[PDB]
Write a structure and sequence with these properties.
- With 292 residues, the chain is an alpha/beta fold.
- It folds into two domains: 198 residues, Rossmann fold; 94 residues, Helicase, Ruva Protein, domain 3.
- Helices cover 46% and strands 15% of the residues.
- The chain contains twelve helices and ten strands.
- The strands form three sheets. The chain has a five-stranded parallel beta sheet, with helices on both faces.
- Strand 4 and strand 5 form a beta hairpin.
- Helix 10 packs across helix 11, helix 10 packs parallel to helix 12 and helix 11 crosses helix 12.
- It is classed as chaperone.
- The entry lists the keywords AAA domain, chaperone.
Amino acid sequence: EREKLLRLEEELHKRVVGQDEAIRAVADAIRRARAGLKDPNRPIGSFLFLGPTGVGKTELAKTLAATLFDTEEAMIRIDMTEYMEKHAVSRLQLTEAVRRRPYSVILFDAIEKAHPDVFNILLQILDDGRLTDSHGRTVDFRNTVIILTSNLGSPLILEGLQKGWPYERIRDEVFKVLQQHFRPEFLNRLDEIVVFRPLTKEQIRQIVEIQLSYLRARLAEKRISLELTEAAKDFLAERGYDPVFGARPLRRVIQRELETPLAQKILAGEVKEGDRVQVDVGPAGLVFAVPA
C-alpha cells in the first residue's frame, strides 16, 4: 500500500493525460486519508469533479479504481441522470455492490440531477462512512472512494480560462454557483472539489499519442514500426474529439482511419515483417508508405 500510494500520481498519469491539479488533490486526499489523519468513519476520499466533458473525469475514476484496487472491476457507477424515479429504493443495489466489494470506487454521474432523497443516502456515506440498507444490516463504506461529477461550474470555468483570470478567482466564482445547488453540509464534507480543465487541442493530440502506443506495441510483435506525420496526428486529433461526446470517437476514428487500412496492407503483404510504416495525410484520410 505504501509503495503504491507514493507512486500514485505517476500511475494515474500513465493513463490520464494532463489534469494535474485533479491527480494531486485526489492523491493527496488518499495519502492524507491513510496515515490516519482523517476521521476513520469516513470514505477514503470524496470528490467533486467539475469542468468540461470527456476530459478525464470518468477516465481518472476508472484508472483510480485500477491503480488503487488492482482492477477496473473495483468501479461502481451510478448514472444518476437515470435515477429520477424511486431512486432511494433502487439502492437499498448500491449497498450490495459495496457489500460484496468494500474496496471500490463509486462514481455518481451528474450529481445535480439527483433528488434531495439521494443526497441523504449520499450524505450518510460522506458522514460516518456507513449506510443502513433495506433489510437493516449496515454496509461499510470506509474502504471506498467517492467521486461525484457535475457540469455546474463548467461554463464559468471555461470563461475563467479564456479571459485567463487567476485560478483563485475561478474556483471562488465557481464555488458560489455550487452553493446554490448543494447543501453546505454536502460541500463541506467533500475531501476535495476538483476542477478539470479544457482538453486543449494539444491534450487531444497527446491522447492520440498514448492511444497510438498500444497499436505500436501490438505491431512491435511483428517488428513493424509506425511513424506518423504531425498532420496525421492532428487529423486524428481533429476527427477524434467532439464538443459534446469528448474523446470517445477517437478510438472508432483511429480504428477506421488507420487500423482498417493498415490491416488490409498487412494481409495483402504490402506491409511485411520489420517494415517501417510511414503514415501521412491525404485528400480525405491517411496514406501509407513503406520505405524502399
